[PDB]
Every structure is written in structure tokens, then in C-alpha cells.
Design a protein around this ligand. Structure first.
Ligand SMILES: C[C@H](NC(=O)[C@H](Cc1ccc(-c2ccccc2)cc1)CP(=O)(O)[C@H](C)N)C(=O)O
Ligand SMILES: *[C@@H]1O[C@H](CO)[C@@H](O)[C@H](O)[C@H]1NC(C)=O
Ligand SMILES: *[C@@H]1O[C@H](CO)[C@@H](O)[C@H](O)[C@H]1NC(C)=O
Ligand SMILES: *[C@@H]1O[C@H](CO)[C@@H](O)[C@H](O)[C@H]1NC(C)=O
Ligand SMILES: [Zn+2]
Length: 696
């Protein structure tokens, strides 16, 4: 009863080549599953993380290249526009020829970069105010500095949009970096050197005098500034409670409760906010309702900003934009980022231009690219099979509610309510293939010149931000997908109560209609349960069946959730990560992902058990002395065969809310009685601790 099909031969070969059978499954299942891969592969110079999963992403880019790189006569305008955008991006000769000129022409439009001008105070300081400058960068270019104001969905009323105020992102990957010692020293040094190098190129290009000492002096004050901001931001661990984060005020309240004085204004929230929203002919009453995500940070800001010049503030503000633009200019400008990206990512070269460009067009025209992708690469009836798997796993979640001892009856009911109400999205929106008019009209207001990449990217920034802003007074569109099709990932949205499985992730090793069921459940099955369980993790349990932030938990059941989940905070917090210098994972920041992983694994396996019940056992795979329960776990694990550059491990231990792949594997299986049954693991073997965490 060995399966001998070509599809079985492909699966088996892949499983064999990745694994190391010389390792005991019960000693370290990651090494058992993945030790073959580890030994054979070295992380590319252009990769910060590399592994089976990242390889799928690499392989998707190859498809994008194929479908973008050749004009076809029947191409509708939406597709012509994406191909032209592609072409403008890969023409390095045209870009190199422009030097930094396309940046220099921009600079006057954001109130300048003082470091890199003469007499900035005379030109710009006159008319400068922080209201105007912050708003310009925000509203025109989508760049949010000092104070992060955005239109988004209303957590407590999911059909509506509202203005939000939050702390800004930083130039370094997390607030931690701004310690600037030890493992962060090189990044902080590279960051300031990067500032300086760019200011120098700009001055050289402007034929201005260059005084290195004054360069160093101005850019160090930028760092000192952003240090204070960083230190003023709230930690992720203090931002993990959506009920606590949601503070709805009026602009009046805001003016009265969070005053700032910049360059001696002081600061008018009404004016700042209108100077943004005026940009889509929208008018803001000092009686406008606003969601304020970071009250404490605004409070802390007041003392900081009062100490700095307009010139100081704009040196940071404009750097934070210029930062992003340099890799879209000529080689000298591209070059200047080298040490910085090495410090953050460990990479010694940039990815191939065509790959960066394929990704850029994908990111900005996700529907046009998704259409070409699914036409090239996506079966068509994958969709129907996946729809049915999702039905199954949803049922298994529902059914499991009854075995869970730590909730009461009523809370279970509402949990089931929320399960039945999750709306699933599989592969791609049929629209993007079937409705040419709609797709064209999405990009109507865009027109790309093939010789002007920089103008094209700027146009995109302006477009996407004008687009987001105008949404204020409009309802949330219930049709809209939260991902393009051409993406190797999946998603849950709490505002929308929606799970999304783009075509991009519906392929081996996760899924094929042609691969064994054990593989499908331990792969895409696990991913489905993961996304579902997000509706019920420490964030998405606070949102109800309709995506509104409202407490549907009893006191006891909510306290019990915390208790059950605390086990995982401790388990994963106790993992130390060699590649990140021996640091422990953050068990709080990874909690939600770890809950989804552990829940999803249990759900998928149950669903497979049920499959076997109903359908009988599957023919075995050749070359593998494993049964299908064992294969389920093998395939599960091999999703995460991979490794990290040390520099990136230091980054993602802070910035990634997922555990690193090896610990996703060890974590979840440590917690699975089923795993330990399958591989006959001794009690208190490493893979089989007596104490096991469970939430869903
Ligand atoms: C790769 C990672 N994405 C994920 O982990 C899941 C999708 C997912 C979930 C579980 C697995 C998994 C597979 C095998 C074994 C363990 C976990 C793989 C992908 C998507 P998600 O976390 O909902 C993200 C927020 N969109 C990321 O965005 O960086
Ligand atoms: C790159 O753009 C320049 C603009 O002058 C053009 O001359 C050249 O033909 C383009 N290269 C290609 C191969 O598209
Ligand atoms: C905002 O206030 C500034 C202060 O000079 C003023 O010049 C400008 O007209 C105001 N803008 C709006 C949108 O009210
Ligand atoms: C490690 O686990 C122990 C046992 O629960 C716990 O007391 C400790 O706080 C954990 N350490 C971390 C950093 O999670
Ligand atoms: Zn997740």
C-alpha cells in the first residue's frame, strides 16, 4: 500500500532531502525535520532569512517577472500600467543618469533638509511651522513623523472610519536600538554615518561647501532627538490591550489635554489636522472625534520638543523621508545605504533589481498583478478544495469549544457566534479577472512614464495617501480584500472578522489537491486554524462577530484566558536564541502568534483525524518509514526549515510578533500530546515536557 504516483514521488523526495533521520525526533524535532536542509543550504548574501518559506517567495517573484516583462497586444490598460511601472523600475541606466536630481526637486516641497541647505532659516524657517511641515510629509507623501495621524477603521464601530493619533515609527527597527550599545552599537553608528553620507552627496550635487564637523554635529543632534522620541514611545507590551489602547476624544479634548509648544507656537491640533485633511477637501471641527492610541507619548513629547529648533526637528523629519528615497536614485545614493542595511539585515548585496521591481509593482498594483499571477500559476479548483478544508477546520474549532474547561457556557456561545460569522476569502477576488472596467478604474488616476521611476514612486505615495484620507466620511467597503493574490502569506482581520488565503500560499508544501491529505492538513490546514485562532487570541478576542471592539467575555472566562495564555508567555520567553546572541524571545510580544500556532496545530490534526475516520487511511509515501500521522508533523515542521543572519535575528527578536520558525516548531509540538504519541516520545524528553500549555 505504497503510493507510487509522480505527485507522491515529489512529496516524498522533498521530505526525505530536508530531514535528518540521524537525529531522534524526540530530542529535537526541528533538527530531525530540517537537518538535511540546514547542512545543504547557506543563506544567500542578499537574504536576511532563508528557508523553505522564503524560497516560495523567491519562486513567486520568478512568476511575476514572467508575467510583467513582456508586453502583449491584448493587455488592458491596468496591465499596461503595471508593465510600464515595471519597465521604469528596471531601467537602471535611466535612473543612474538622473543622479539625485529627482530628490533635489522634491526637497523644497517638504520645507527642505536644513543640513543640506544654505540659509535654511531664511528660506524656510520663516514660513515653517510644525503643523505645516508634519502635515505636508503626512498628507502628500504618506510619511508620518513626530506625530502619527492616520485615517483608519473605528475599532468600536467597524463600518466607519475615524482619525487616529499614534506614536510614530523610528528610523531604527525598534526603540531598543536607541540604547546604541553592545549589539546595537554598529546600527546606531551606521545610521548616523548614513545621515551624514546622504547630506554630503546632496551638498556635493548642489555644489555647496562641506564641513564634515558641522555635518557630524547636525546629524548627531538628529540622533539625540530621535533617541528621546524612541524613549518616549510606549513598548509593544504596553500596547497589546486594544481596550486600553482605544481612547476616543474630541480635538478639543486633545488640544486641552495634550498641548505642545514647538519653536514657540504653540501647537494647534485643529490646524495640523485640517492642514492634512484639507488635502482631500475635507473639513475638521475642533469637535471632531479622534482615537488616541498613545496619550502617554504625546504627554512625554511636550517636554522634549520644547528643547529643539525648527531646524533640528526638520533635520529629523526630512531625513525620515529621504531615508526611504535614496535606493530609488543613482548608484552613489543607493551605495550610501550599504552599511546601514548590513547592520539591520546582515545582507552584503541588494536583491536583483527585477525582483525588487516585481515586488514594488505587486505592492502598488496588487489586483492587476494578482490577476496576471493567478492566470499564470493558480489552478482554479484549488479554491473549491480549500473552501471545504476551511469549513472543516471551522467546525473543529466550534466542536472543540465543548471540551474546553476554562470557559463558561455563555462565553462559549458567543465564541461560536464569532466562529460562524468569520468570512473567508480564498485565492483571489473573481472580479480582478472577470471585470476589466473595475480594474482599469482602480488605477485611472495613475499614469506612469517609463523614463521617470522616481516620479512614478512619488505619484504612488501621493495616490495611496490621498486615497486613505478621503475614506474618513465613507463606510468601510465589505467587498475589499486585505491582501493581493500574489502573496505567500495568510491573514486575519479583526475589524472585518475575515480570514484570507491568497493564491500565493496555496501550493506545496502547504497545499496541493494532488498531495497527500496528511501533508495538506499539517500545512495549509495548520495555517487555516492559525488565522481562525487569531480571532480569539489576546488581541482578536476583544473584537466581536462584526469586528467591533466590545467585551463579550465574562470576568471569569477572561481571567481564565489570561491564565491559560500565561503558560505560553513563560514557555516561549524561556527560549533563548543563539543567532540573536543568546537573548530570550519576548513571550509577551509573540503571545498572539504563539496562541494561533498552538491552537491551529491542534485544530488541523483533529480535522485530519476526522478525515481518516470518515475516509480511511492514506497510502504511504515511498522512501519514508513513517506513517501519515508522523508525516503530518514532518510536513508541519518543514514549513520552517530555515535560518537567520545574526544581525537580522537581533532585529526580528524585537520587531517580529512571530516566534522564529524553529521555536514555532519546538513550542507547538512541546505542547502536543498528539505529537508525542506519534513519535513515541518518553515523558520529559525534550519534545515532550510534562507541563504543556493549552488555550484553544
Ligand atoms: C510568515 C508569517 N505569517 C504567519 O505566520 C501567518 C501564516 C502562517 C501561519 C502558520 C504557519 C506555520 C506552518 C507550519 C508550522 C507552523 C506554522 C505558516 C504561515 C500569517 P499571520 O500571522 O496571520 C500574519 C499577521 N499575516 C509572517 O507574516 O511573517
Ligand atoms: C532606459 O531608458 C532610457 C531613457 O533614455 C532609454 O533610452 C532606454 O532605451 C531605456 N532602456 C530600456 C532597455 O528600456
Ligand atoms: C493653519 O495655521 C497656519 C498658521 O500660519 C495658517 O497659516 C494656515 O492657513 C492654517 N491652515 C488651515 C488648513 O487652516
Ligand atoms: C521561564 O519559565 C519560568 C517557569 O514558569 C518562569 O518563572 C520564568 O519567568 C520564565 N522566564 C521567562 C523570561 O519567560
Ligand atoms: Zn499569525
Amino acid at each position: 500500500g505504497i503510493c507510487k504516483s509522480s505527485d507522491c514521488i515529489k512529496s516524498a523526495a522533498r521530505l526525505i532531502q530536508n530531514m535528518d533521520a540521524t537525529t531522534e525526533p524526540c530530542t529535537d524535532f526541528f533538527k530531525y525535520a530540517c537537518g538535511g536542509w540546514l547542512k545543504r543550504n547557506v543563506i544567500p548574501e542578499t537574504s536576511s532569512r532563508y528557508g523553505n518559506f522564503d524560497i516560495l517567495r523567491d519562486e513567486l517573484e520568478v512568476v511575476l517577472k514572467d508575467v510583467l516583462q513582456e508586453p502583449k497586444t491584448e493587455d488592458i490598460v491596468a496591465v499596461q500600467k503595471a508593465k510600464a511601472l515595471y519597465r521604469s523600475c528596471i531601467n537602471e541606466s535611466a535612473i543612474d543618469s538622473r543622479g539625485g536630481e529627482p530628490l533635489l526637486k522634491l526637497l523644497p516641497d517638504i520645507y527642505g533638509w536644513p543640513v543640506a541647505t544654505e540659509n535654511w532659516e531664511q528660506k524656510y524657517g520663516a514660513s515653517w511651522t510644525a503643523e505645516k511641515a508634519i502635515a505636508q510629509l503626512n498628507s502628500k507623501y504618506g510619511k508620518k513623523v513626530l506625530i502619527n495621524l492616520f485615517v483608519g477603521t473605528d475599532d468600536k464601530n467597524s463600518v466607519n472610519h475615524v482619525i487616529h493619533i499614534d506614536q510614530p515609527r523610528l528610523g531604527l527597527p525598534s526603540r531598543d536600538y536607541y540604547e546604541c550599545t553592545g549589539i546595537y552599537k554598529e546600527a546606531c553608528t551606521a545610521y548616523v554615518d548614513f545621515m551624514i553620507s546622504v547630506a554630503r552627496l546632496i551638498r556635493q550635487e548642489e555644489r555647496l561647501p562641506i564641513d564634515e564637523n558641522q555635518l557630524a554635529l547636525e546629524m548627531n543632534k538628529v540622533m539625540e532627538l530621535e533617541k528621546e522620541i524612541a524613549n518616549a514611545t510606549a513598548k509593544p507590551e504596553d500596547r497589546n490591550d486594544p481596550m486600553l489602547l482605544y481612547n476616543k476624544m474630541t480635538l478639543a479634548q486633545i488640544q486641552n489635554n495634550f498641548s505642545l509648544e514647538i519653536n514657540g507656537k504653540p501647537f494647534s491640533w485643529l490646524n495640523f489636522t485640517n492642514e492634512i485633511m484639507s488635502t482631500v477637501n475635507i473639513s475638521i471641527t475642533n469637535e471632531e472625534d479622534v482615537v488616541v492610541y498613545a496619550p502617554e507619548y504625546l504627554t512625554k513629547l511636550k517636554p522634549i520638543l520644547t528643547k529643539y529648533s525648527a531646524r533640528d526637528l526638520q533635520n529629523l523629519m526630512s531625513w525620515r523621508f529621504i531615508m526611504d528615497l535614496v535606493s530609488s536614485l543613482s548608484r552613489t545614493y543607493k551605495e550610501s545605504r550599504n552599511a546601514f542595511r548590513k547592520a539591520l539585515y546582515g545582507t552584503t548585496s541588494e536583491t536583483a533589481t527585477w525582483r525588487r521591481c516585481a515586488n514594488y509593482v505587486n505592492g502598488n498594483m496588487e489586483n492587476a498583478v494578482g490577476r496576471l499571477y493567478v492566470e499564470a500559476a493558480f489552478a482554479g479548483e484549488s479554491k473549491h478544495v480549500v473552501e471545504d478544508l476551511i469549513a472543516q477546520i471551522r467546525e473543529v474549532f466550534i466542536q472543540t469549544l465543548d471540551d474546553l474547561t476554562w470557559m463558561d457556557a455563555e462565553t462559549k456561545k458567543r465564541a461560536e457566534e464569532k466562529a460562524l460569522a468569520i468570512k473567508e476569502r480564498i485565492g483571489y477576488p473573481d472580479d480582478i479577472v472577470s471585470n476589466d472596467n473595475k480594474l482599469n478604474n482602480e488605477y485611472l488616476e495613475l499614469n506612469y512614464k517609463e523614463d521617470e521611476y522616481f516620479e512614478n514612486i512619488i505619484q504612488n505615495l501621493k495616490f495611496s495617501q490621498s486615497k486613505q484620507l478621503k475614506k474618513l466620511r465613507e463606510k468601510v467597503d465589505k467587498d475589499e480584500w486585505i491582501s493581493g493574490a500574489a502573496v505567500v502569506n495568510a491573514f486575519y482581520s479583526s475589524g472585518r472578522n475575515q480570514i484570507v488565503f491568497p493564491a500565493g500560499i496555496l501550493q506545496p508544501p502547504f497545499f496541493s489537491a494532488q498531495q497527500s491529505n496528511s501533508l495538506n492538513y499539517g500545512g495549509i490546514g495548520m495555517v487555516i486554524g492559525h488565522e481562525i485562532t487569531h480571532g480569539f487570541d489576546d488581541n482578536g478576542r476583544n473584537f466581536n462577530k462584526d469586528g467591533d471592539l466590545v467585551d463579550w467575555w465574562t470576568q471569569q472566562s477572561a481571567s481564565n484566558f489570561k491564565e491559560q495564555s500565561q503558560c505560553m508567555v513563560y514557555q516561549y520567553g524561556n527560549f533563548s536564541w543563539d543567532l540573536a546572541g543568546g537573548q530570550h524571545l519576548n513571550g509577551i510580544n509573540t503571545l498572539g502568534e504563539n496562541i494561533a500556532d498552538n491552537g491551529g496545530l491542534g485544530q488541523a490534526y483533529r480535522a485530519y483525524q476526522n478525515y481518516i475516520k470518515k475516509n480511511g487511511e492514506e497510502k504511504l509515501l515511498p522512501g519514508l518509514d513513517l506513517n501519515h500521522k508522523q508525516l503530518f508533523f514532518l510536513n508541519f515542521a518543514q514549513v520552517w526549515c530555515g535560518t537567520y543572519r545574526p544581525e537580522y535575528a537581533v532585529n526580528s527578536i524585537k520587531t517580529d510578533v512571530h516566534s522564529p520558525g524553529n521555536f514555532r516548531i519546538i513550542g507547538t509540538l512541546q505542547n502536543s500530546a498528539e505529537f508525542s504519541e506519534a513519535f513515541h516520545c518518553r515523558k520529559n524528553s525534550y519534545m515532550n515536557p510534562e507541563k504543556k500549555c493549552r488555550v484553544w
